């Protein structure tokens, strides 16, 4: 039961200072090497930087991309690994990752962390409820959608009746255009379904600190 | 450092389809692994020192090479194999993966299932105007939209987004989303998104007149 979990992302600007952590579970943390890692969006995976084992003074090694501005520590009392981020800039944007290595292999990665650089401000969501003007043209089937507009930075959260109507659902990578974002999400489900039951858009964006619900509502009668 | 080049970057085979993807070392590195990536989250260890799979990975899979040439096999192409799959060398500083193989499923073509929607009036009220059309559960994933207003093709204005392959049904889908002022909204009265999909060769037509909703 190896765990590993980054936190700490967020949005920054470029030239700022930001501390990534990564708290670690099912291991004996101190015995294991350390690293970071980390994804553009669209991008290949990079290895960034390792910290060794208290015992070797091999100490820690970096990327030449980081190398200089970014420093691995460690805290085996917490079983937790560090990333202090210095003189940020654009391409330092990315899911961070730590993982755990066993001679060659890094074996166990945690789920990410986001960290974005960016000079864009920070920009609640307008969230808009699309209601049919038909059923699909098989039967049968209506899709409803959501229109989630003018945000910035990512992620949004999008579900539908919180979550439990996940079948049938699209949601669409967001798109970047004049630094906000908008994405839109479809539902299908059967016309007997819908309107007699209700749906409802939830849009969480955490940046701004905002939740949005929008219920679905029928044209007419 | 070891530059790592991987082959083809993206492919497609059927299910119980043989595929096997290279990874190609800019000199000689004694052993290779490779990561499983679904969906842009936490990579999964796959196989690790060239030839070993990690636990719980399928018999259908299987590493090899040496040197400067890797390899990975799926013996029988199935849907829970669609990933990216990136190799990568843990032997010398700096620690390098290669670009990636996105591996796809073929299955049979589909049509997609297309819907209009009108601007909101809660955006209406906003002073914008989007209209959005969905191009849902269709395959192979080359499609065209078009948009028409009162008869006249429009192209400025209009921004498209495109799922990754559905873990259910192995379709992709479309959002194409045309933004006007509610002014030249407000000029017009109907709205139209076209799609030509291999399907067929009539497009698919869904349309509304803002002055009946």
């Known amino acids: 039961q190896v765990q590993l979990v980054e936190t700490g992302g967020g949005l920054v600007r470029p030239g700022n200072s930001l501390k990534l952590s990564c708290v670690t579970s099912?291991?004996?943390?101190?015995?294991?090497?350390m690293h970071w890692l980390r994804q553009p969006p669209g991008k290949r995976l990079e290895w960034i930087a390792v910290i060794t084992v208290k015992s070797d003074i091999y100490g820690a090694n970096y990327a030449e991309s980081v190398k200089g501005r970014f420093t691995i520590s460690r805290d085996d009392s917490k079983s937790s690994v560090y990333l202090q981020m210095s003189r940020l800039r654009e391409e330092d944007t990315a899911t961070y990752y730590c993982?755990?290595?066993?001679?060659?292999?890094?074996?166990?990665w945690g789920q990410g962390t986001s960290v974005t650089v960016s000079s864009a401000k920070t920009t609640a969501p307008s969230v808009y409820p699309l209601a049919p003007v038909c059923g699909d043209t098989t039967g049968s089937s209506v899709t409803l959608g959501c229109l989630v507009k003018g945000y910035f930075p990512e992620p949004v959260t999008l579900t539908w009746n919180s979550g439990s109507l996940s079948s049938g659902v699209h949601t669409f990578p967001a798109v970047l255009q004049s630094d906000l974002y908008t994405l839109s999400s479809s539902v299908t489900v059967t016309s007997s379904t819908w309107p007699s039951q209700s749906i409802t858009c939830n849009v969480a964006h955490p940046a701004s600190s905002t939740k949005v619900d929008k219920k679905i509502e029928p044209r007419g009668p | 450092e070891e530059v790592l080049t991987q082959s083809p970057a993206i492919m497609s085979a059927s299910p119980g389809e043989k595929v096997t993807m290279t990874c190609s070392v800019s000199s000689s590195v004694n052993y290779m692994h490779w990561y499983q990536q679904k969906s842009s989250t936490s990579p999964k260890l796959w196989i690790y020192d060239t030839s070993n799979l990690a636990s719980g990975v399928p018999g259908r899979f299987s590493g090899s090479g040496s040197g400067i040439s890797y390899s990975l096999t799926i013996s029988s192409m199935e849907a829970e194999d669609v990933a990216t799959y990136y190799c990568?060398?843990?032997?010398?500083?700096?620690?390098?993966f290669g670009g990636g193989t996105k591996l796809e499923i073929k299955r049979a073509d589909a049509a997609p299932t297309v819907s209009i929607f009108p601007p909101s009036s809660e955006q209406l009220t906003s002073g914008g105007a989007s209209v959005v059309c969905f191009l849902n559960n269709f395959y192979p994933k080359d499609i065209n939209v078009k948009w028409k207003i009162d008869g006249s093709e429009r192209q400025n204005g209009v921004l498209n987004s495109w799922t990754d392959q559905d873990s259910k049904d192995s379709t992709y889908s479309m959002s194409s989303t045309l933004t006007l002022t509610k002014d030249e909204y407000e000029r017009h009265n109907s709205y139209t998104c076209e799609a030509t999909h291999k399907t067929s060769t009539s497009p698919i037509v869904k349309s509304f007149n803002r002055n009946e909703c």
């Open positions: 099912g291991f004996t943390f101190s015995n294991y090497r």
């Open positions: 990568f060398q843990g032997s010398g500083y700096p620690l390098t």
């Open positions: 993982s755990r290595s066993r001679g060659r292999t890094l074996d166990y």
